[PDB]
């Protein structure tokens, strides 16, 4: 019974992930200077990214958690709030338009989508991603909270399966 | 206003880092050459969990359960085949009364794991309703209202890198 990293190759390093999350936090801090934002974590895969991001935010903040299959967030938490959805990966954009439809129906003041990883191949249609840490090639990736069969979430880096 | 303004630091992000390193080295050693399924108790334990798993070096499966305080457990992502005849460690943010503790042991244990341990970042032994066997504890704390590092009040304060007291 061996550590899961030996089955993987580094694709994006943990230091590279730390610099992108810093960049993203500086950006959110600036765009929402003196305002309040509700950050929405899309479980399960965004949890590690979310844990690292929220610690570098310096604005008034509320945090909420949902899953993709929950489209569920209450109207009281959406109506007239600034929402930012925090996702691990956008591939087709099927999940995206479902989160932007099911939340946008309770009329937030603003609604933005951030993803750690974006895979532009097989994109459904027109998707507005307000924040992207990494635009990656069309590859099966694990680590930094993203799993395969409940393995690899624990890796501090984004990896390929050998 | 940033929520840090109305808090005071109680446990620093450096103290946390060091406790989580210590816990990871205990688990790495205790389970050397074994597989473990770690169960994260959402929502509060997500940040502790994110940091802990990154320092583990054993063969791992991760699973998720949500506890809401009456305690309701929801099996967010917890499947019988990663518990039955496996080594489980439950990862929790705080034990205060021990009520959630025994409901978790009962809810996971009914799938008949081979072993079942409980880890908690914080233990507040005041107002315990029962005796508990905590396998791992990062910090035994005083009876105070604490927040941060994952722990909320009405969806506030999770973002703090430290455990804070409220002013
Ligand atoms: Zn996702
Ligand atoms: Zn679709
Ligand atoms: Zn808890
Ligand atoms: Zn009880």
UniProtKB/TrEMBL annotation, chain A:
- Give GO cellular component annotations, separated by semicolons: cytosol
Checking InterPro entries in the record gives: HGPRT, Hxn_phspho_trans, PRTase-like, PRTase_dom
Q: What is the protein name for this chain?
A: Hypoxanthine phosphoribosyltransferase
NCBIfam families tied to this protein:
HGPRTase (TIGR01203)
| Chain ranges of the Phosphoribosyltransferase domain | 14-148
Gene3D superfamilies with a match to the protein in the record: 3.40.50.2020
| Catalytic activity as recorded in UniProt | IMP + diphosphate = hypoxanthine + 5-phospho-alpha-D-ribose 1-diphosphate; GMP + diphosphate = guanine + 5-phospho-alpha-D-ribose 1-diphosphate
Q: Family, per the entry?
A: Belongs to the purine/pyrimidine phosphoribosyltransferase family.
